[PDB]
Amino acid sequence: NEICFIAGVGDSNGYGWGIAKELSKRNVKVIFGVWPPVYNIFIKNLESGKFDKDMIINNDNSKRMQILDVLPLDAGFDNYDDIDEDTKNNKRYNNLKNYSIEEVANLIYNKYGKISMLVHSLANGREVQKSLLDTSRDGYLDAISKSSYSLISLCKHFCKFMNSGGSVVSLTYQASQKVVPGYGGGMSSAKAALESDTRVLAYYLGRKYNIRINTISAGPLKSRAATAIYSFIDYAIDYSEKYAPLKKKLLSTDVGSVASFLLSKESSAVTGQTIYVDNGLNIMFGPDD
Amino acid sequence: NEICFIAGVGDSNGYGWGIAKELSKRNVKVIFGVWPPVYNIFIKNLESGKFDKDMIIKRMQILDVLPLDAGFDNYDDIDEDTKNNKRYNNLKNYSIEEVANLIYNKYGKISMLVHSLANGREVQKSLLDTSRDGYLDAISKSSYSLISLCKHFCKFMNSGGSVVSLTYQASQKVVPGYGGGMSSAKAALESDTRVLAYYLGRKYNIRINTISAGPLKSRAATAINSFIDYAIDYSEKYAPLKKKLLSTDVGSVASFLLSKESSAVTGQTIYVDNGLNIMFGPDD
Amino acid sequence: NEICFIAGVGDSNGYGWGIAKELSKRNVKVIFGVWPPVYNIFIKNLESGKFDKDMIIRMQILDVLPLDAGFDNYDDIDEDTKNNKRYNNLKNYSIEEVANLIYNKYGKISMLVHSLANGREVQKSLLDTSRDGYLDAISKSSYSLISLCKHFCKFMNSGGSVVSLTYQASQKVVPGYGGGMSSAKAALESDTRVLAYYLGRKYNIRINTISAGPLKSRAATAISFIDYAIDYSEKYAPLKKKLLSTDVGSVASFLLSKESSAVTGQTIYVDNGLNIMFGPDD
Amino acid sequence: NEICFIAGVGDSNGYGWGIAKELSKRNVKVIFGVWPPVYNIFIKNLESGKFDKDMIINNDNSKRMQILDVLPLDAGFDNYDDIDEDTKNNKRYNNLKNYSIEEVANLIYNKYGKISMLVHSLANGREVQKSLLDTSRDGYLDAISKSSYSLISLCKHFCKFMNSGGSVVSLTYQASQKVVPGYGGGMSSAKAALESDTRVLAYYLGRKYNIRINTISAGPLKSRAATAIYSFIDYAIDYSEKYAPLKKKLLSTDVGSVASFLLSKESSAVTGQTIYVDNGLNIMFGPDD
Ligand SMILES: NC(=O)c1ccc[n+]([C@@H]2O[C@H](COP(=O)([O-])OP(=O)(O)OC[C@H]3O[C@@H](n4cnc5c(N)ncnc54)[C@H](O)[C@@H]3O)[C@@H](O)[C@H]2O)c1
Ligand SMILES: NC(=O)c1ccc[n+]([C@@H]2O[C@H](COP(=O)([O-])OP(=O)(O)OC[C@H]3O[C@@H](n4cnc5c(N)ncnc54)[C@H](O)[C@@H]3O)[C@@H](O)[C@H]2O)c1
Ligand SMILES: NC(=O)c1ccc[n+]([C@@H]2O[C@H](COP(=O)([O-])OP(=O)(O)OC[C@H]3O[C@@H](n4cnc5c(N)ncnc54)[C@H](O)[C@@H]3O)[C@@H](O)[C@H]2O)c1
Ligand SMILES: NC(=O)c1ccc[n+]([C@@H]2O[C@H](COP(=O)([O-])OP(=O)(O)OC[C@H]3O[C@@H](n4cnc5c(N)ncnc54)[C@H](O)[C@@H]3O)[C@@H](O)[C@H]2O)c1
Ligand SMILES: Oc1cc(Cl)ccc1Oc1ccc(Cl)cc1Cl
Ligand SMILES: Oc1cc(Cl)ccc1Oc1ccc(Cl)cc1Cl
Ligand SMILES: Oc1cc(Cl)ccc1Oc1ccc(Cl)cc1Cl
Ligand SMILES: Oc1cc(Cl)ccc1Oc1ccc(Cl)cc1Cl
Questions:
Q1: Which chains are adjacent to chain B, needing at least 3 Cβ pairs under 8 Å?
Q2: Domain tally for chain A?
Q3: Kind of pairing, strands D56-57 and D63-64?
Q4: In CATH, what number is assigned to the domain containing residue B26?
Q5: Under DSSP, is residue B26 helix (H, G, I), strand (E, B) or coil?
């Protein structure tokens, strides 16, 4: 049976969960990588059944979402040596161990073997609520460290543990290509680098492992992280539902099925791409009223 | 049960056929639209089992094979010279409008539309030496044809229905050899894919995309100018994936593009070319 | 002194004029190609000094010739347009004819400008456009650029330069810019690349296109499309300047100068930066 | 008379120097920011008239260039408070002071007044010789701090000290948009962020200061930096000279004159842009033989 590691799921409200669901539709088992400060919170809501409501696969619990494992993961660190004394001291990291990208890499591979799929649905900006102009070297590089370099780290450590013909997917946002005031802290710069890095990784992973990698430029989803920004997320959504060529409402599962498709053998000739999943809003010049 | 009309198949060596195959895999019934000057030959091949080897997916279910000339929007457009032409006389209802009426009357609303046709008489000429008539014909048969298909079919299409066409990267990067305004036609078709996505999306909740395919030894590709053998070899040498590109590779992306699983994708140019388009140039 | 041929000026309220003006600042002489059905009126208003207002800085106009970019050479003109009152007074107006006429009188020129479009169904949506309307938009607005280059480039100086004007509805959906015009503009930008390859290798001639913002030109005024677009550009572009005919003109002048001799095949945005925005910034 | 501050320059073999030259012929006065480690040498080269021939502009001989001033500048530091101790006690800096970004900006405003023009021609990355996949987070983030964030810091520190309608330009390279093996260390990512940043900065500089920013995507130049990587640069120059639509050799003043134009009021309505000065190589699909 096939497996996909989904780095960056903190609850059932994000894109990673939506991706997990659609992979369930085609019988691949999911391993989540959870950011440590919310790892217990999560494994708790999962034990109690708060997500059973969300593990329904359209045929209503005749088919379940197979969560093979859940692990602590801080893609901010590539291996143990990188971990600083203080984060080892933190009350949220005391309990937990083996959570560097290499740690979870090795762990999964030592137990489950080679896997086929790999998802990167995480990101973080310290100063996301600052304009790129008012952003500091530290915040900027933090955004980029957490949101861009993290994909590279994942590939480096995972892709030698993956099946030939395997596939990697990440999420991005169009602020990398067109100015969205409000998407700040160098998050636009991070996405811009992610997109570029997707191509360059496609070449190395393609030639070395025959592995594919693509990124989905998603439309606005009211996830937890999204919510953070005086409701920048509500505006992007009402702007989208109003002016997209497709007046539908965007679901996590819309991105979910495109990821599932990108992760399958059905797209074995597509690599290095930014595929837009935003109800066609990227094609528009502006509001059509 | 879902139906797709595939305009632009004349044998089993091109992309239309590969898309048909992949659509059969998910139980989609296929109607072929066939250029009349090649129609009776294609039907004979079919009838005598030449394509049987190539029908194996069990086997592809061809619901119908109709004559279609994507240069004619309706009956009145058809000149007498072709109405009197050896290869059209016995054939009727081959306007874009007439086959859309035909198909609609015989089967009702369809859900999927495939455009996989192109034509340009001066593709041997550099753009620079291409004539106004060559250039315009290339754009008439390869770009306008797409708008007309949509204009005539999309009244007769199920909401949430989907349209895909084929393109080539010659539109965005200079490929010498790809002439007669074919590079211009592909360009217009990519832009047109956008604009139709707005009108088709708002009006009928219909999606339209285009696949930028890599090189494939189709009969058309072969008729160009040794050129395609060079493009195939260059692709298999320098793509990120060194796999060999198959019609079914484009086929499965089209199928995905023609299904509700991509119901938030529209107006897009998708590259199915083994990653070739991301490279700067040769890596040796 | 260097010469620039500018096709697509029927008045002074457009981009072609702005390009002339800015070129005049550089001591480059200028030839106008004019759509015959307005050549008689243009020459008159130029007679009466009606244009002396805008000509000043002085714009030295070498010649004004009737040019119909619908016809590539003499034999393409059909019986009917020959027998039309709009043209009657005028001959030698095919792309080839004015190219020969210009070379015979002046020799090789250094600069070429394409600033003309037309389509007869620009009023209809792309989906509502017909084959003949669509193909007309493309013939006039797009192929013509290739016909100019084919005919003028053998008569140009090694190191010569060509520019045309385009609009962003080729890359992003602009309802209102219909009739296959978005379509013609998409071709034009692509063609700018392929042309750059051939012209560059064959004659060392560069070619670029400018993607310009809204201007209240004559042609723009028949669509209230352009009024809407100017308000939108002035409200949401990164720069608040009102866009000037001569802003495009000044980038043009640059592109036609040896100061840009490493730039070719490009689409250059001269639109106060508007292209770069996701949407209205309120 | 207008003044331009040119960041990355150190020997007249590069593009910073080429921009200097072409601004010169427009009678603009030029100031050099120079990386401290190479600063003493550059001034000893210059005051001994070694670049005396490179300062010549038609008419020749001659009509020379005249450098208003030359400062030390480490664009990897935003303000004094940043510059650490190890570096305070480094053989190259114990001899220099006021080289932080804000330090040099303040020094210039004080002494010269507001300036019209700003040029970013600086870049650096410790691990460029590594493929993106094999690149560490430190090397990667270094590439991006020095090569990209610099553009932002400069802009943050100079914008209030700049004339209304002032212009800024940086240099990029197509490896950000198409895979260029050999361009490792996260430089490709750096340039992608840079290009994206150019757009975002154009929004903020344009609204708040009526200030323009563009970047130039240049073709290969046998500069000192490009020399470092079995000659990546010789291959790239040859490739370009063979296959570009225009067969000429590309000179630092080719980019210099495009920059001078972008830095002048002739490009009044051009901002946010990536402009290609590469003899058209960017447009070709591949080798046309
Ligand atoms: N939501 C949208 O509107 C939208 C649009 C386009 C793209 N995206 C992208 O989709 C992806 C998923 O975002 P989402 O909206 O589902 O957010 P989310 O809040 O559902 O998921 C983000 C998760 O990443 C994890 N994370 C944060 N920092 C981490 C770190 N340092 N190490 C390891 N894990 C960390 C957190 O556990 C968090 O739950 C992100 O990359 C985002 O940029 C989102
Ligand atoms: N083969 C490749 O390498 C390649 C690569 C990229 C894109 N494409 C595109 O894929 C599409 C399919 O082409 P293909 O390579 O399968 O070639 P093909 O020869 O298999 O198919 C082209 C079809 O169009 C038909 N046709 C021509 N003129 C017509 C008209 N006026 N009306 C109706 N039909 C007409 C031909 O009979 C033929 O069946 C084309 O648009 C082509 O441009 C092909
Ligand atoms: N005005 C704008 O807002 C705008 C924006 C972007 C691009 N453009 C482009 O700039 C160019 C100039 O247009 P404009 O806005 O200055 O309008 P304009 O009226 O100044 O230019 C149109 C010119 O083309 C001429 N013309 C029409 N058909 C012709 C033919 N068959 N042969 C020769 N000439 C013909 C007209 O007589 C007129 O002189 C066009 O290519 C246009 O698409 C304009
Ligand atoms: N050389 C090329 O082929 C080429 C092509 C396209 C773009 N570029 C870009 O143009 C710019 C100039 O490069 P070049 O080719 O002139 O190389 P160069 O070596 O001539 O110039 C680079 C300058 O940056 C300086 N520098 C290095 N680290 C610095 C730091 N931490 N702080 C401040 N300054 C620092 C160097 O000392 C040098 O003066 C670079 O950004 C480069 O990426 C170069
Ligand atoms: O990428 C996103 C795009 C949008 Cl429209 C909404 C939310 C997104 O996700 C994030 C945005 C900023 C930060 Cl700091 C972290 C995350 Cl996960
Ligand atoms: O688009 C194509 C791209 C490639 Cl690489 C090969 C063949 C292609 O298809 C055509 C090319 C020219 C003409 Cl006249 C007709 C068609 Cl169908
Ligand atoms: O290209 C243009 C773009 C804009 Cl915003 C405004 C006017 C334009 O110019 C034209 C538009 C349509 C037609 Cl039929 C002819 C011309 Cl000259
Ligand atoms: O960007 C460049 C592109 C090219 Cl083709 C050549 C040199 C370049 O400049 C650099 C390349 C690498 C590093 Cl580490 C630093 C610099 Cl300044």
A1: A, C, D
A2: 1
A3: antiparallel
A4: 3.40.50.720
A5: coil
